[PDB]
mmCIF file of N, CA and C and ligand atoms in Angstrom:
data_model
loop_
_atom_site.group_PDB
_atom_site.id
_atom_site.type_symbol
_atom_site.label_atom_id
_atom_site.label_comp_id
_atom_site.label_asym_id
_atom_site.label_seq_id
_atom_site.Cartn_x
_atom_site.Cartn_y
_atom_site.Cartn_z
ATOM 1 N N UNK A 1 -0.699 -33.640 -42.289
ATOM 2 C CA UNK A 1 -0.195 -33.856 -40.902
ATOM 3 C C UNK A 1 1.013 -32.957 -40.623
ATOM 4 N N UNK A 2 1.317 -32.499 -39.675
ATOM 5 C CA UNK A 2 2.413 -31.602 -38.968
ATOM 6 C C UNK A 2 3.904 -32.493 -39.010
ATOM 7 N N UNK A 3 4.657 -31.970 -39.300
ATOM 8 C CA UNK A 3 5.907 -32.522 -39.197
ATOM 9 C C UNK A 3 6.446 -32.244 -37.913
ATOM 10 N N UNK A 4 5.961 -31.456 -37.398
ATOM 11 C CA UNK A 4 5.706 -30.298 -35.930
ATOM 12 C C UNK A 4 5.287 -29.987 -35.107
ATOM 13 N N UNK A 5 4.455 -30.008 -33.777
ATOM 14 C CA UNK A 5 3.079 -29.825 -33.373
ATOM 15 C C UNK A 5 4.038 -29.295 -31.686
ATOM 16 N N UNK A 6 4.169 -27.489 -31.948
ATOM 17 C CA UNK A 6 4.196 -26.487 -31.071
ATOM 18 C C UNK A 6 2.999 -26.099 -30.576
ATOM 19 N N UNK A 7 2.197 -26.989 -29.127
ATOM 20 C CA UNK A 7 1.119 -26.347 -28.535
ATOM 21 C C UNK A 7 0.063 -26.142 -29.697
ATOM 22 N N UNK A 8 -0.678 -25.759 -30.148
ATOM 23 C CA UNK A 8 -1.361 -25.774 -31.403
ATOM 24 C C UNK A 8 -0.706 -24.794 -33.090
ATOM 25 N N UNK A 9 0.545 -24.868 -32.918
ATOM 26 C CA UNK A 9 1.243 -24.484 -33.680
ATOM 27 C C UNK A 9 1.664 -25.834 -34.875
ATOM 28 N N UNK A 10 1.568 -25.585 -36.002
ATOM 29 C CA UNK A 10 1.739 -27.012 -37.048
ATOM 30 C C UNK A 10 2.676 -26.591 -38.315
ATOM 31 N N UNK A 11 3.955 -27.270 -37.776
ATOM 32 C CA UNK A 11 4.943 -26.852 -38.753
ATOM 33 C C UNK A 11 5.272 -28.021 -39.793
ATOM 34 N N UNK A 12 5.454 -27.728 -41.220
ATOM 35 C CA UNK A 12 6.361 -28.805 -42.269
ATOM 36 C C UNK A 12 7.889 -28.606 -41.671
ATOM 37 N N UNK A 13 8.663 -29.529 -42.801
ATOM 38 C CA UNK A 13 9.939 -29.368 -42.800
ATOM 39 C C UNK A 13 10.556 -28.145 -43.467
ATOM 40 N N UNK A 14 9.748 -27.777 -44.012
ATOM 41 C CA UNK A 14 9.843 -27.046 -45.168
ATOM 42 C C UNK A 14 9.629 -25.425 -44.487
ATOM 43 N N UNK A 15 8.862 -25.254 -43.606
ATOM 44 C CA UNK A 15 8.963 -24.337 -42.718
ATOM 45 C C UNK A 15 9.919 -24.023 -41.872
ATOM 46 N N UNK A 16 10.269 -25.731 -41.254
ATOM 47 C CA UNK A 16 11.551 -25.360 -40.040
ATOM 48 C C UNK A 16 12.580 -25.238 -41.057
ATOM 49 N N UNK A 17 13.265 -25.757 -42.422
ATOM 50 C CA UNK A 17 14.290 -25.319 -43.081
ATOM 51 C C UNK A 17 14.461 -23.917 -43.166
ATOM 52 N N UNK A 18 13.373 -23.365 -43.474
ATOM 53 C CA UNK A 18 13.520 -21.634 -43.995
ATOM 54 C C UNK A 18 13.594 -20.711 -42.933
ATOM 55 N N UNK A 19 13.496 -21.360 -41.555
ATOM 56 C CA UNK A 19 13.632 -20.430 -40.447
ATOM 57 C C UNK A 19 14.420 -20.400 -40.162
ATOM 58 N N UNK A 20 15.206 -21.615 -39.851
ATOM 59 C CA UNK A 20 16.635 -22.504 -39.589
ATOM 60 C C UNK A 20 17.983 -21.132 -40.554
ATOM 61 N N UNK A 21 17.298 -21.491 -41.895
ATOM 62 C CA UNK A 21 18.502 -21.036 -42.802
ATOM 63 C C UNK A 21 18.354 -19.324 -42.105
ATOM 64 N N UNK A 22 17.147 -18.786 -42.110
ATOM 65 C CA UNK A 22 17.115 -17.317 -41.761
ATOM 66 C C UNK A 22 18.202 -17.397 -40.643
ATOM 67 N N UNK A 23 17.956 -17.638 -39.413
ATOM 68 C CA UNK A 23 19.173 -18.094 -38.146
ATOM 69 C C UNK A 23 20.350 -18.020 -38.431
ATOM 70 N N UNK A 24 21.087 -19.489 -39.214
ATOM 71 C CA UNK A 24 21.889 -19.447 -39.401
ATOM 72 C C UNK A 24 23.111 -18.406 -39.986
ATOM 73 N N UNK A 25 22.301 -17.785 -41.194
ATOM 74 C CA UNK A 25 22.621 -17.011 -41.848
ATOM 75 C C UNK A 25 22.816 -15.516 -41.249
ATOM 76 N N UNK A 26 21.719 -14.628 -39.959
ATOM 77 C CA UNK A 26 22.847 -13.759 -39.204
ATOM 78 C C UNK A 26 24.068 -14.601 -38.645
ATOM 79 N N UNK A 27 23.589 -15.777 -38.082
ATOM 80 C CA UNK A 27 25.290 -16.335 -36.984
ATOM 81 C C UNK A 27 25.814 -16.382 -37.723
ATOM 82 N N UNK A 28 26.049 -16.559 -38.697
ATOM 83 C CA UNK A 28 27.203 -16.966 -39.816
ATOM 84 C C UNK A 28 27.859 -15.097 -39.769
ATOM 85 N N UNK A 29 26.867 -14.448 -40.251
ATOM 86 C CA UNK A 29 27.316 -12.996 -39.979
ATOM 87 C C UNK A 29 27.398 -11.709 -38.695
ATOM 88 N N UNK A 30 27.326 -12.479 -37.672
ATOM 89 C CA UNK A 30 27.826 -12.098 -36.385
ATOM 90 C C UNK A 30 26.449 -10.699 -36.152
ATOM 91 N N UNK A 31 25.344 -10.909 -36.580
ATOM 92 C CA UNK A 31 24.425 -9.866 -36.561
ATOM 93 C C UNK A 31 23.152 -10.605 -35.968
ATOM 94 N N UNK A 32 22.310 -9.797 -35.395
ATOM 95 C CA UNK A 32 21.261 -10.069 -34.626
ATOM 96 C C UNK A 32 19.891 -9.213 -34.970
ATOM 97 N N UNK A 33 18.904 -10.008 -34.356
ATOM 98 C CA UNK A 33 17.469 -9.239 -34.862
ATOM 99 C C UNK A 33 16.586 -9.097 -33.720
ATOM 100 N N UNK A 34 15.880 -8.341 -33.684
ATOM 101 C CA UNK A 34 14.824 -8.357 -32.101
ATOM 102 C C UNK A 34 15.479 -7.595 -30.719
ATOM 103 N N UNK A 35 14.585 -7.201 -29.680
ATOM 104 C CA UNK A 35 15.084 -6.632 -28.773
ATOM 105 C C UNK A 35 15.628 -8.202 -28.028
ATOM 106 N N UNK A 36 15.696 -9.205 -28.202
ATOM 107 C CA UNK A 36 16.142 -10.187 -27.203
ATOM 108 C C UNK A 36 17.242 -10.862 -28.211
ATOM 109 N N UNK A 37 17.709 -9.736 -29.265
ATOM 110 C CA UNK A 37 18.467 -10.471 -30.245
ATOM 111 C C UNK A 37 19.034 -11.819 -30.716
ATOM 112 N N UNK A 38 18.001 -12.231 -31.760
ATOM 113 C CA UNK A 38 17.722 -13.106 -31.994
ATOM 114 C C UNK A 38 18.884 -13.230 -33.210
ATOM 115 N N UNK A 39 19.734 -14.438 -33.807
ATOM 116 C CA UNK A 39 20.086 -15.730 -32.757
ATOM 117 C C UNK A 39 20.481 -15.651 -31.780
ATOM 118 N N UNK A 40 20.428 -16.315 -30.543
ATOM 119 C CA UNK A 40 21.227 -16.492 -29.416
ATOM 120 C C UNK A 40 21.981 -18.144 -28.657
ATOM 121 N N UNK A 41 22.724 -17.972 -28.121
ATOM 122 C CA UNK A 41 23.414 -19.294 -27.763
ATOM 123 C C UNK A 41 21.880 -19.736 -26.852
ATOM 124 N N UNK A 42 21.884 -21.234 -27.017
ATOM 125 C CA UNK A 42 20.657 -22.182 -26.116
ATOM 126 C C UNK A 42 21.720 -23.093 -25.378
ATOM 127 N N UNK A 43 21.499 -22.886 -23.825
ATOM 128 C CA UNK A 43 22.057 -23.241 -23.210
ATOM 129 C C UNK A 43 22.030 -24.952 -22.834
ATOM 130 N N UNK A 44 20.666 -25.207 -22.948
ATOM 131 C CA UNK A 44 19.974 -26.566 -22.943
ATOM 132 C C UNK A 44 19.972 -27.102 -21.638
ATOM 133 N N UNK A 45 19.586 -25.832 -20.662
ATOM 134 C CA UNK A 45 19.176 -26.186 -19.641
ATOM 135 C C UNK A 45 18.289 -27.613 -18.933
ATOM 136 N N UNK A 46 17.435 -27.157 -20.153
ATOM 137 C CA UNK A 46 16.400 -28.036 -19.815
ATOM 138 C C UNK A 46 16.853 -29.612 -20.016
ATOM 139 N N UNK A 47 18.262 -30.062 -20.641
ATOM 140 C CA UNK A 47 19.215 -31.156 -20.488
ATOM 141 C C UNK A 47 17.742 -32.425 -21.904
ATOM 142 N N UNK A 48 17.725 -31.444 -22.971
ATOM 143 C CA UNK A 48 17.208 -32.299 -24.339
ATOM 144 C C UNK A 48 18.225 -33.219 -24.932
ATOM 145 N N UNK A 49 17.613 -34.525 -24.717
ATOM 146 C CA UNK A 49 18.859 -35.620 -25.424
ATOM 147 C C UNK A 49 18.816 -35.123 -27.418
ATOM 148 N N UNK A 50 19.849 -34.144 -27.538
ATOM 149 C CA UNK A 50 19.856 -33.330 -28.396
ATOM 150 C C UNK A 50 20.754 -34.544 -29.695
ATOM 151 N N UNK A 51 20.638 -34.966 -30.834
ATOM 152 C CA UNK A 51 21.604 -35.648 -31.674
ATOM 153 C C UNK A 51 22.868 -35.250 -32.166
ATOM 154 N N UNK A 52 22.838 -33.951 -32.188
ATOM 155 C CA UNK A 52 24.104 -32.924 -32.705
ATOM 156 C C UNK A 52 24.663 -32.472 -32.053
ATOM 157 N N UNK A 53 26.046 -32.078 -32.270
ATOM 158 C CA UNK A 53 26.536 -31.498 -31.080
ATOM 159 C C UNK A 53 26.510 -29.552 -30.598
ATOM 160 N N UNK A 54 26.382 -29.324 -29.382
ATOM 161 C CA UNK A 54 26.617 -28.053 -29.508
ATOM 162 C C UNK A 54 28.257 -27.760 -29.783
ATOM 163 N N UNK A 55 27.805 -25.843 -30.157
ATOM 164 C CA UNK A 55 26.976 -24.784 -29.109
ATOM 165 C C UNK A 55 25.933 -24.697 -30.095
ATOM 166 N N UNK A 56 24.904 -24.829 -29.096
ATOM 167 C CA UNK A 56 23.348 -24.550 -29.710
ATOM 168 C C UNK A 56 22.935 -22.833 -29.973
ATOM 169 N N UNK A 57 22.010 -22.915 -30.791
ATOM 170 C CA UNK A 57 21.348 -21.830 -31.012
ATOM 171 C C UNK A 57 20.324 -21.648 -31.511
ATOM 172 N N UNK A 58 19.257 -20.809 -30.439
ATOM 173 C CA UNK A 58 17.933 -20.272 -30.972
ATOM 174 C C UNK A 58 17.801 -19.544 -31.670
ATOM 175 N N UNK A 59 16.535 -19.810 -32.851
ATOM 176 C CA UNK A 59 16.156 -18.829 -33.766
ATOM 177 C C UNK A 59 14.439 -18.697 -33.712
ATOM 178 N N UNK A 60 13.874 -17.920 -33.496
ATOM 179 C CA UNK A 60 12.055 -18.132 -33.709
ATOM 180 C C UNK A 60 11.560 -18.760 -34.958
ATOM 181 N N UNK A 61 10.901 -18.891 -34.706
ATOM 182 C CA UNK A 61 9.858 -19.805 -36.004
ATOM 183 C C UNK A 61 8.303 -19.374 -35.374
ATOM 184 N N UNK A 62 7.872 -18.455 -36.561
ATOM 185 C CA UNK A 62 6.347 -18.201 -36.595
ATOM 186 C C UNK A 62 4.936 -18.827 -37.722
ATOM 187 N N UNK A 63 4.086 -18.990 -36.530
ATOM 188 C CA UNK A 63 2.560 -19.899 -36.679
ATOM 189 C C UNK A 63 2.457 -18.893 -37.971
ATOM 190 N N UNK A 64 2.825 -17.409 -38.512
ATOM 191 C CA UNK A 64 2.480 -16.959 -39.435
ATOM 192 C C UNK A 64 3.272 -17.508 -40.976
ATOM 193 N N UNK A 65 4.387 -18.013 -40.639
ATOM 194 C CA UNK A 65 5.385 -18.673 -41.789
ATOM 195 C C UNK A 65 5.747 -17.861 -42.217
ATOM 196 N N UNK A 66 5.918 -16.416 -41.567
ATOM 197 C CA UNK A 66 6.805 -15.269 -41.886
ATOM 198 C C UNK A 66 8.130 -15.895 -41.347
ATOM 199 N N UNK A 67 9.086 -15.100 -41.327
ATOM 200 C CA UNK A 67 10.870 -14.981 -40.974
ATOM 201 C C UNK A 67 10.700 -13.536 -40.251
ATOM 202 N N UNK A 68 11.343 -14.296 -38.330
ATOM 203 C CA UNK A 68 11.341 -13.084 -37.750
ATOM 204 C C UNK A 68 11.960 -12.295 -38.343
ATOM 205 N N UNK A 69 11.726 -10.854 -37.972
ATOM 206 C CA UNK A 69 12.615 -9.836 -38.280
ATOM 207 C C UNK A 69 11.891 -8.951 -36.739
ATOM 208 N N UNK A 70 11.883 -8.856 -36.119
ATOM 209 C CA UNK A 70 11.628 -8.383 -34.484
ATOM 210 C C UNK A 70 10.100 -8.395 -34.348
ATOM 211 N N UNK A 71 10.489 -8.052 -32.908
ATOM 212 C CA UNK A 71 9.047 -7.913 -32.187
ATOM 213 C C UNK A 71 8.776 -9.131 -31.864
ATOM 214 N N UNK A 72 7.576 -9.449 -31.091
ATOM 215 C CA UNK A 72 7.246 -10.577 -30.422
ATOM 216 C C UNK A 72 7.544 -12.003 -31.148
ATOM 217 N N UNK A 73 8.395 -13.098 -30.583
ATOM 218 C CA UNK A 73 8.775 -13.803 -31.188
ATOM 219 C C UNK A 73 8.088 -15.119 -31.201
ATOM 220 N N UNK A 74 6.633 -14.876 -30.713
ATOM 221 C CA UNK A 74 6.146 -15.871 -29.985
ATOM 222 C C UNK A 74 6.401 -17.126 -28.829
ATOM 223 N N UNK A 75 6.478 -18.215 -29.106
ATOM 224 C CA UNK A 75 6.456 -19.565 -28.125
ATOM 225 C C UNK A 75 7.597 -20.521 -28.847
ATOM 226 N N UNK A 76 7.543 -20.589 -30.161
ATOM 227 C CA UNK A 76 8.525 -21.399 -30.878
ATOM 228 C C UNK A 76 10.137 -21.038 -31.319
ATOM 229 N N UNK A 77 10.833 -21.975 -31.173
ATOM 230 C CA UNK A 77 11.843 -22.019 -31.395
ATOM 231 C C UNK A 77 12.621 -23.348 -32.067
ATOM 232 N N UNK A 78 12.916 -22.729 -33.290
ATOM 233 C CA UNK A 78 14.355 -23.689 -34.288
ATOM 234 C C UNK A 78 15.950 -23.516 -33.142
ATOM 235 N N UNK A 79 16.703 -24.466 -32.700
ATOM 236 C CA UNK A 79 17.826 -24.672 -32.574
ATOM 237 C C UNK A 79 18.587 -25.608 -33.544
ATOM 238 N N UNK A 80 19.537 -25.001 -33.875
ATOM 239 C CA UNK A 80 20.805 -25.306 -34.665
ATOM 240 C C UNK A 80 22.364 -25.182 -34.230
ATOM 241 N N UNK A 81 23.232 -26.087 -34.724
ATOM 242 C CA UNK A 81 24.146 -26.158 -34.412
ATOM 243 C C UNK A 81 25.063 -25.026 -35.239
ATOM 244 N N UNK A 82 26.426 -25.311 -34.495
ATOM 245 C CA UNK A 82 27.378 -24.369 -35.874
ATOM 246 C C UNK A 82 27.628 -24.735 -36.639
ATOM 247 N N UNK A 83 27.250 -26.500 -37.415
ATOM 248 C CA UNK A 83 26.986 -26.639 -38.392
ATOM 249 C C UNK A 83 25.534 -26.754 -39.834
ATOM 250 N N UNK A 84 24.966 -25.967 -38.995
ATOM 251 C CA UNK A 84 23.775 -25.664 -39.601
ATOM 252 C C UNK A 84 22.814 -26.676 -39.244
ATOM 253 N N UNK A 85 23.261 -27.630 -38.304
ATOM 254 C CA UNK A 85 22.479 -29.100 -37.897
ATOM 255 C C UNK A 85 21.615 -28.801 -37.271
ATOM 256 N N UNK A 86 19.959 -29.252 -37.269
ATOM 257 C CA UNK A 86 19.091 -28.994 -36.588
ATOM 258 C C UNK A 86 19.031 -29.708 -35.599
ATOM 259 N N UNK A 87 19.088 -29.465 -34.299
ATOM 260 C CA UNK A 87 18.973 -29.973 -32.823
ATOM 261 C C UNK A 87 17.702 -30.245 -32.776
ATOM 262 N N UNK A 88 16.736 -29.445 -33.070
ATOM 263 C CA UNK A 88 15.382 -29.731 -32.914
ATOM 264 C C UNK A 88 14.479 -28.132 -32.598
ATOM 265 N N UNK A 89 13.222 -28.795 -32.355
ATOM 266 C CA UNK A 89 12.226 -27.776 -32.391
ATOM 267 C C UNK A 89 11.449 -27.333 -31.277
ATOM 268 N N UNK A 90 11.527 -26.087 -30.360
ATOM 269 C CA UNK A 90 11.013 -26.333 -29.167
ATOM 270 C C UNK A 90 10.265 -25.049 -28.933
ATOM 271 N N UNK A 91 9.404 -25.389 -27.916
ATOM 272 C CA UNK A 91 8.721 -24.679 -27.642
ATOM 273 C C UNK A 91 8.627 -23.997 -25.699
ATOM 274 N N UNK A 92 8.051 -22.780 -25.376
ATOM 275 C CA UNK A 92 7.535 -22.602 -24.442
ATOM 276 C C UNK A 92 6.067 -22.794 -23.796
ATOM 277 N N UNK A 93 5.015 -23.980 -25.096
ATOM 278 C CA UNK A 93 4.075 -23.945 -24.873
ATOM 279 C C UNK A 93 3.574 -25.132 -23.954
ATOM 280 N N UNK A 94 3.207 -25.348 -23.034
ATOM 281 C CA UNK A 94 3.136 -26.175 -22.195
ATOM 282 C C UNK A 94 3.685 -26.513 -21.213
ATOM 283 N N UNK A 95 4.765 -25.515 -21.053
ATOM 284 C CA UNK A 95 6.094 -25.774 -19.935
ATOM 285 C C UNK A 95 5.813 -23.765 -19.222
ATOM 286 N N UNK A 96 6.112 -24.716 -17.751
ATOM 287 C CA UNK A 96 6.359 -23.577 -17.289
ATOM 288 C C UNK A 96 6.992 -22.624 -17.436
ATOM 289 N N UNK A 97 6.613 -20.857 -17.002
ATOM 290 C CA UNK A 97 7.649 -20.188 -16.922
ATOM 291 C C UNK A 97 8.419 -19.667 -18.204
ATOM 292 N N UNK A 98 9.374 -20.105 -18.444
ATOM 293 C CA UNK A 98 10.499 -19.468 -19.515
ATOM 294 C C UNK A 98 11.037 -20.846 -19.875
ATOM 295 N N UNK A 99 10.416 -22.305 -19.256
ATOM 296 C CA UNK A 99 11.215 -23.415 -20.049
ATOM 297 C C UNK A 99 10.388 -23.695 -21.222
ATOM 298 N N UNK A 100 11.254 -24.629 -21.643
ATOM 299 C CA UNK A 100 10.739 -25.027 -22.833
ATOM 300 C C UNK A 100 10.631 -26.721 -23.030
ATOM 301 N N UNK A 101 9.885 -27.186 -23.591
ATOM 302 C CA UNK A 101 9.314 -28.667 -23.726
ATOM 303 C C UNK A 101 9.154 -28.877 -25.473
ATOM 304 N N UNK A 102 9.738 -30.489 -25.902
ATOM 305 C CA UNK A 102 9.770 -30.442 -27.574
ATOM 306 C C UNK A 102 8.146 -30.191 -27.950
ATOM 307 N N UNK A 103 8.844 -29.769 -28.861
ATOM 308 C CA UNK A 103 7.551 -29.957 -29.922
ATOM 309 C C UNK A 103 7.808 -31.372 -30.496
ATOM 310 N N UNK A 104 6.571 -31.853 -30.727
ATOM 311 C CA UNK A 104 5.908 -33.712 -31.048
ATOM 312 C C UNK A 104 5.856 -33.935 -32.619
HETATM 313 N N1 3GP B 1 14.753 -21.856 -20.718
HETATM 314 C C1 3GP B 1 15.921 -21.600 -21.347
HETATM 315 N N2 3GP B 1 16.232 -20.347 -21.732
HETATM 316 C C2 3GP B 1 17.473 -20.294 -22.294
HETATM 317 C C3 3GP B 1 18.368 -21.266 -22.518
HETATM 318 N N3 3GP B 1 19.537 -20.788 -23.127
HETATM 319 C C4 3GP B 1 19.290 -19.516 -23.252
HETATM 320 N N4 3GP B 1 18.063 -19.133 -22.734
HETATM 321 C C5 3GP B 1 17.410 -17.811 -22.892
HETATM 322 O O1 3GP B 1 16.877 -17.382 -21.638
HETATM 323 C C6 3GP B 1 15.641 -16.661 -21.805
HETATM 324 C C7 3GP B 1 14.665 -16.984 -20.678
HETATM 325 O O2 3GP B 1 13.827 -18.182 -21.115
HETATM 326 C C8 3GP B 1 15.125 -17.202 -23.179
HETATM 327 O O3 3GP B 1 14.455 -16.336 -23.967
HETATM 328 P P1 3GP B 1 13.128 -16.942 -24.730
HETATM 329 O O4 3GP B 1 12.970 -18.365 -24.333
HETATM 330 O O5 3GP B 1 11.930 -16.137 -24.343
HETATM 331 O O6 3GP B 1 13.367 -16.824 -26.175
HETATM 332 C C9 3GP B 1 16.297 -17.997 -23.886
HETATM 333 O O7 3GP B 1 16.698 -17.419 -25.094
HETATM 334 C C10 3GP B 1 18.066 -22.586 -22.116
HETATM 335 O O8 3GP B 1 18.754 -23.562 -22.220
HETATM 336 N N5 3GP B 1 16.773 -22.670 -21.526
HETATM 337 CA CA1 CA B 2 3.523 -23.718 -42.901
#
């Protein structure tokens, strides 16, 4: 079973940890990856009753269980706090536009 379920995307914990840590680990070093340079602050527009506190931040998480390193970042997204706290797991799949809706 999915610990995860991005639109037909099926993640463990064990997946969102290793994406999470990839993330964290440029913010920690003030460096970025991708043309939409990836990590970036998540504003939380979309107003997610989030458990942790911000400032949030997106990192991709890929259906391949690679670790971005650029180029298309797909639909999913790990947010984390500045303490490495996972906010949660979200996606653009099912939501209009450029928002984003949890992953289940
Ligand atoms: N929808 C949304 N986009 C945000 C937010 N904070 C920052 N952004 C950025 O704005 C861009 C437009 O959605 C996003 O790129 P991305 O979602 O394709 O990765 C996202 O990184 C937020 O709270 N909601
Ligand atoms: Ca996996």
């Amino acid at each position: 079973a999915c610990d995860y379920t991005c639109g037909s995307n099926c993640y463990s914990s064990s997946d969102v940890s290793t994406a999470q840590a990839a993330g964290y680990q440029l913010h920690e070093d003030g460096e970025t990856v991708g043309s939409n340079s990836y990590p970036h602050k998540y504003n939380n527009y979309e107003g997610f009753d989030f458990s942790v506190s911000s400032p949030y931040y997106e990192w991709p998480i890929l259906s391949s269980g690679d670790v971005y390193s650029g180029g298309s970042p797909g639909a999913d997204r790990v947010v984390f706090n500045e303490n490495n706290q996972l906010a949660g797991v979200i996606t653009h799949t099912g939501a209009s536009g450029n928002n984003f809706v949890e992953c289940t």
